[PDB]
Design a protein around this ligand. Structure first.
Ligand SMILES: O=C(O)c1ccc(NS(=O)(=O)c2ccc(N3C(=O)c4ccccc4C3=O)cc2)cc1
Ligand SMILES: *C(=O)CCCCCCCCCCCCC
Ligand SMILES: *C(=O)CCCCCCCCCCCCC
Ligand SMILES: *C(=O)CCCCCCCCCCCCC
Lengths: 269, 252, 55, 237, 269, 60, 269, 55, 60, 55
């Protein structure tokens, strides 16, 4: 981790650690004792908060969807990506290739909707969240045969309990997920660009298992991703521009930095 | 002494009198694929000295106003030699590179270039609900150029090229985490980077994925006084390293 | 089959794994190995400070 | 069964918690690893890498490459200033979007030494000397060369070897300093002056540039994760 | 599990591994190195997801029934079979004989029913699910003496708790359950065909133990079967046709495959 | 009693979970096994068996 | 701990333990056997309740705020200090420098607010409390992107469960927190006095994650601090005056003690 | 009476049985023995590849 | 799972309780200690120190 | 990795730490060391009772 400062006295020598050539593409290994007289300091500081498995291993909200126990929008569909929401996305894009296991956690809430229904009296709601791996049947309605879940992972959750959670393995067909792809999936080099199937990891469906009330209730499910067991390769400059789309790297040109008055001024504007 | 260098690959030899060392990747030198990392079950083709040798690309003038240039690596050598004739007959291949950029000028000239090899440099589009076409990203040994002003948004399949965002939406001054050297005209006249194969799969098709992009970007413009040479070229030379190919089929 | 490991301090804790999949285990927090020499000093020749970088 | 009792914090979702949870896909074997070049295991690996500093950034310079360039020229006398900016990465306009500075808007605290490198990009007939100074805080910025040579400084002579390093020692009352602006954990001021004029012969440009780089030393550390102020959204993408 | 590829060079030999006789009823043991030059590959792949105790060991919804706390249909009756629902049924019918232990899990939900009752105010519902082994008394009403459960297994569940579950042994009189029976139970060979008593495993009853509200509440119970400790013998071709009935193998004649344009075309229709 | 704390994922029904649960019939002894020909222990056993391919499949 | 009394007989000696000089700034070490005849007593008393890690290690309410699921004041903001509430503050100010780890515990309650809304029917409320370390984005509305919590610690709590709690390390940049600061943060010695950044420890935000009801509900969150692992240095006289402000030591002049009739009277007034 | 077994990886876990019936135990996930030779090669005579199947 | 039973006093907040609770900031290393003069470890240390008594306290 | 310590009496208890941070541990209640001699008797010269404080 952090290294200890070593004491140094006066010099007058043919050594020149301060002078260097930065054209070589090498970062100089100069320490403070080289350029000045220092005392010996014992350092007890650590670099344990800046591990990759600390930086990326906190739950982050990626998406939220709504669905109702009446009318249209009886269920919610979402294709799992960590690219809908800015904050998690930016952190993963300090790297080109990442490999991790997910832990999904769901915060499901319900809100009574305005109506003129007399004598509402909800029963407790039970919700079903169904993970469907790539390919295979997709529910086209609440009350299809796809919600049987004979071989699709699924959880059921009654209100007023702890959030559900489940672990997902590393599901890539590649040896790492890629956050950037500089190519086309077609051999003609036509169609969509930057689209790849290394990051597929199914679709998520959510519904009510009962309409408890005679009146309308609308639920909101929020999905949290927590990377764990992380490994990362090839670091990249942070994103400077705001994101526009979830499938593209497209951007509006942004200035390098914010301005200031002069090149000698000691304040920001 | 430390400034003289010679690199021999196949027929080719490069010699420089001013050299800033050689940068090697992420401290990994090119190697052949192991049998404990391989997936494909056929015997590889390894042409050796017919693929792994220096190829010069077209030169491009450095002017007092020039914004920069880029070349996408497997598709800038795709029409050249038997390197280009092994990647259209095979479905797979993997290779590293040695990139050597030359640019010589007098001791009365000044300027500075940044030479970077950027893994998977995916580049934005001027219009925000389209992606670029393959005729705006890929040259073929001709360099594509950056712009100094934003590309206007039409109904475009154009690339968003601006030097200061590097066409990727990042600060251009932070491209120094990628393997790099500077050509500063008062010091050195050449730069050498040796890239290893970087991908998340052991081999990949090379006619629809570009796994590296070379960019040469002026940070300090070219300047000289009247009476000096007004034409200063920048030549790029690229050699494959440990090329393999697998999945022999028909041409295309 | 318990592991006993040291805690982060300026003691020890006990952990048992309960599941048959190794993707169910808690995150690895205490891995502190590092090597900045891939990204700093990627040069082929060995640079010695207190000697010219270019002769 | 076994008599048990629940404590405060049961049935909560803490976002920083580490607990075990069953897999939704049991007995799933993951694909083998391959060695990919350039594995990262710490972010202080990649904060020790030089990154071009946009010292200039005055009006319309941030929308060009002129931000990174620092003017120097042949002028009458010497002891005129070249630049000045305050030490406070992850706050200052100059340092907030550098590679060092963006691994430091995810943290509340920072400690250790920082090294600036300078690279002279004139012609090979140009020559000069500079005074690269750093003043601890408590007396404001130096406004003369003679005020600035009472702090830490290095005199840089340009010849073969076209770079020089000003390493900024850690001189602080506290063991850590805030990333965000506070006057209790003020950093000091970094200034540059002509020690000697830029001297050129005929037919060589008398205007030259300097480029600046910044990186952390090996005694550097960061602490206490937080959201960065530099990414936003109004709706899902 | 998965075997390692072995390298091979050129051949010119009297060996003929590629030529075979497929009339012998033997599947050829040819590997890729026989017919071409290969490199040596180490494989680290496993066949752990295709174990029979992975394939069949996920909960699957088999049935659901409804019952009310007022009026007619005060309780639900169901004879336990895994043949009401298509998805589980198809998986078990990759085999002729299977032997397993069940784990039943019940997801019980309640929904308020429209009425003109003023000042409804439900108390929490408690439900009783009663397993009755073959033979013995059957409840003919809510509030019979059969719900005493002196010797019938039974569970009670109050709303807003975890789903009940219970394990069931292997209950066959035979040495395995049979998924197919090519016979009659009668010696005359009259009556129903394909009916056998090896797969009996009682009937399930479910009711409310209280009507909490003055208004009408209707509950839905969903039964989930999870095989475990599985053993299976004699594999069979998968079902090609849709099922019609739960006691018969009856089918509508279906084509072998979907069509395409030509025998040289590279797309589906 | 022993101080305990519940974590996320308590009182959920995950369909892929493996936990122990009490038997509804305790001390029930199951019928003996017999050796029946052709036991299957993996589905890659029965994917290694030749099967006639309907190459033609054009209209009727 | 407590020491044992030692027996003593008559004296007549040149020893003078009773006489002392109190000008020396030394507290006399006289024990009762010095000045009189005593018996030997065994003491079994202990000083275990007057340890610093008993005195300061009990939960104490520091603040409470309110927020609603409708209208203005959708969330609550509070900068963490133990100086809003008198009782905890006084105890810590027996010392100049203290160092401890917090344990936060939150008691969150909800109360129906009067309205003319017909047919209210609340769903269970879920609350989010978000800790934001010094610097970084601050929510400016309910439904901002800051509540994503990609890297800010956060807890979610559904009603009718145990209070949340979390431990906080010692977060000072100094080697101890200071309860007193006799200086300015500015070098000019202008601006606010007694203000220092050694005691920063972020801001706390709290909101509803759903409006369950159609009618208005107002919640109250109460924050409890419990010091633990305490160390304390340099003791100080207790506060004699009532506190006025939370950032100042400002006071109204108060008499030394309460009065009494005479200097010989044995009662208080 | 705890069993300690290896987890599925690209460590170990502990399991105790709590019930007196062996039909209450968790599913057997880690049984990987197989024998495809009953369904492939059921022929009485031994087939050797690199020799005629029929003489 | 393991059969358990809850006792009275579960899901209560007793202000005097000592239980362990997860940290909101994991792997946070605290600043080193320094020796500061006059550490206090008991309050009977500082009750054994002389203090001027206001014996008079009659009116003003 | 359990600690066994004595209880406060006029027996013993068992404790296991469950977390990887040492700021998650229960409060230290049983530390009874003390030294009043810093605040009482801070004088440079050693005072002996049964002798004049000032000669
Ligand atoms: O609270 C958070 O966890 C949360 C809040 C905001 C957020 N990101 S955001 O870009 O600020 C954002 C802000 C609002 C919405 N949004 C709505 O508020 C809404 C209401 C109704 C339908 C659809 C939507 C919907 O897309 C989506 C994203 C992420 C998470
Ligand atoms: C090694 O694992 C044996 C050491 C003692 C184990 C105590 C186990 C604690 C209770 C059981 C946890 C079981 C999780 C499935
Ligand atoms: C062998 O079983 C003894 C090993 C130690 C057992 C720890 C037991 C964990 C708690 C009891 C589980 C009891 C289930 C009925
Ligand atoms: C030393 O720690 C081993 C002694 C026996 C441990 C029994 C553990 C009790 C149950 C597990 C607690 C685990 C907390 C993460």
């Amino acid at each position: 981790r952090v290294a200890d400062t070593v004491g140094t006295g006066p010099t007058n020598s043919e050594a020149i650690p301060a002078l260097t050539a930065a054209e070589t593409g090498h970062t100089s290994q100069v320490v403070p004792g080289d350029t000045m007289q220092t005392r010996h300091v014992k350092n007890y500081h650590s670099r344990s908060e800046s591990t990759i498995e600390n930086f990326l291993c906190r739950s982050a909200c990626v998406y939220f969807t709504e669905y109702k126990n009446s009318g249209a929008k009886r269920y919610a569909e979402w294709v799992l990506t960590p690219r809908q929401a800015a904050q998690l996305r930016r952190k993963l894009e300090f790297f080109t290739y990442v490999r991790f296991d997910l832990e999904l956690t769901f915060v499901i809430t319900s809100t009574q909707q305005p109506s003129t229904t007399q004598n509402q009296d909800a029963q407790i709601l039970t919700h079903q969240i169904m993970y469907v791996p790539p390919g295979g049947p997709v529910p086209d309605k609440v009350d299809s045969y796809v919600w049987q879940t004979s071989t699709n992972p699924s959880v059921f959750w009654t209100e007023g309990n702890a959030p559900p959670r489940m672990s997902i393995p590393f599901l890539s067909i590649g040896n790492a997920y890629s956050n950037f792809y500089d190519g086309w999936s077609e051999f003609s080099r036509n169609g969509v660009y930057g689209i790849n199937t290394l990051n597929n990891m199914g679709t998520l469906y959510a519904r009510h298992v009962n309409a408890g009330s005679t009146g309308p209730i609308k639920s909101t499910i929020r999905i949290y991703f927590k990377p764990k067991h992380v490994k990362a390769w090839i670091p990249r400059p942070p994103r400077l521009c705001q994101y526009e789309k979830a499938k593209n790297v497209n951007f509006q040109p942004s200035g390098v930095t914010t301005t200031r008055q002069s090149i000698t001024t000691m304040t920001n504007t | 002494s430390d400034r003289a260098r010679s690199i021999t690959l196949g027929n080719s030899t490069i010699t420089t009198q001013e050299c800033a060392n050689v940068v090697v990747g992420y401290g990994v030198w090119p190697d052949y694929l192991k049998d404990s990392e391989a997936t494909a079950e056929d015997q590889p083709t390894q042409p050796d000295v017919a693929t792994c040798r220096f190829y010069t690309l077209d030169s491009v003038q450095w002017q007092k106003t020039s914004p920069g240039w880029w070349w996408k690596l497997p598709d800038a050598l795709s029409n050249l030699g038997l390197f280009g004739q092994n990647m259209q007959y095979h479905y797979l291949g993997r290779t590293g590179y040695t990139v050597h950029v030359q640019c010589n000028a007098s001791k009365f000239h000044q300027g500075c270039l940044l030479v970077v090899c950027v893994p998977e440099a995916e580049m934005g589009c001027a219009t925000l609900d389209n992606t670029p076409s393959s005729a705006e990203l890929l040259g073929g040994d001709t360099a594509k150029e950056f712009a100094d002003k934003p590309v206007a948004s039409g109904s475009n399949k154009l690339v968003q090229r601006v030097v200061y965002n590097a066409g990727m939406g990042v600060g251009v001054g932070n491209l120094t985490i990628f393997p790099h050297q500077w050509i500063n005209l008062r010091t050195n006249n050449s730069a050498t980077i040796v890239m290893p194969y970087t991908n998340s799969v052991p081999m990949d098709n090379m006619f629809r994925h570009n796994n590296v992009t070379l960019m040469v970007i002026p940070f300090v413009p070219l300047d000289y006084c009247p009476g000096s040479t007004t034409y200063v070229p920048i030549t790029v030379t690229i050699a494959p390293m440990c090329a393999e190919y697998n999945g022999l089929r028909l041409a295309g | 089959g318990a592991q006993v490991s040291t805690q982060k301090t300026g003691i020890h804790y006990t952990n048992i794994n309960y599941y048959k999949d190794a993707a169910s285990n808690s995150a690895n927090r205490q891995d502190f190995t590092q090597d900045p020499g891939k990204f700093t000093e990627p040069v082929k020749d060995i640079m010695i400070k207190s000697l010219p970088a270019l002769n | 069964g076994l008599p048990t009792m629940n404590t405060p914090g049961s049935c909560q979702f803490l976002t920083s918690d580490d607990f075990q949870s069953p897999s939704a896909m049991p007995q799933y074997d993951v694909t083998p690893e391959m060695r990919i070049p350039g594995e990262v295991k710490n972010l202080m690996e990649i904060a020790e890498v030089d990154s071009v500093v946009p010292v200039q950034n005055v009006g319309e310079k941030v929308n060009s490459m002129e931000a990174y360039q620092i003017p120097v020229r042949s002028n009458e006398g010497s002891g005129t200033q070249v630049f000045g900016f305050p030490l406070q990465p992850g706050y200052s306009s100059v340092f907030s979007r550098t590679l060092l500075g963006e691994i430091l808007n995810y943290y509340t605290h920072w400690s250790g030494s920082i090294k600036l490198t300078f690279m002279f990009c004139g012609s090979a007939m140009a020559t000069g000397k500079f005074l690269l100074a750093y003043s601890p805080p408590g007396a404001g910025a130096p406004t003369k060369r003679v005020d600035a040579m009472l702090g830490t400084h290095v005199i840089w002579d340009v010849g073969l070897q076209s770079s020089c390093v000003l390493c900024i020692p850690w001189i602080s009352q506290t063991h850590y300093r805030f990333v965000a602006s506070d006057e209790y954990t003020a950093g000091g001021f970094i200034t540059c002056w002509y020690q000697t004029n830029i001297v050129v012969p005929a037919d060589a440009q008398s205007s030259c540039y300097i480029m600046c780089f910044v990186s952390a030393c090996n005694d550097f550390s960061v602490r206490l994760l937080k959201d960065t102020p530099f990414i936003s959204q109004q709706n899902f993408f």
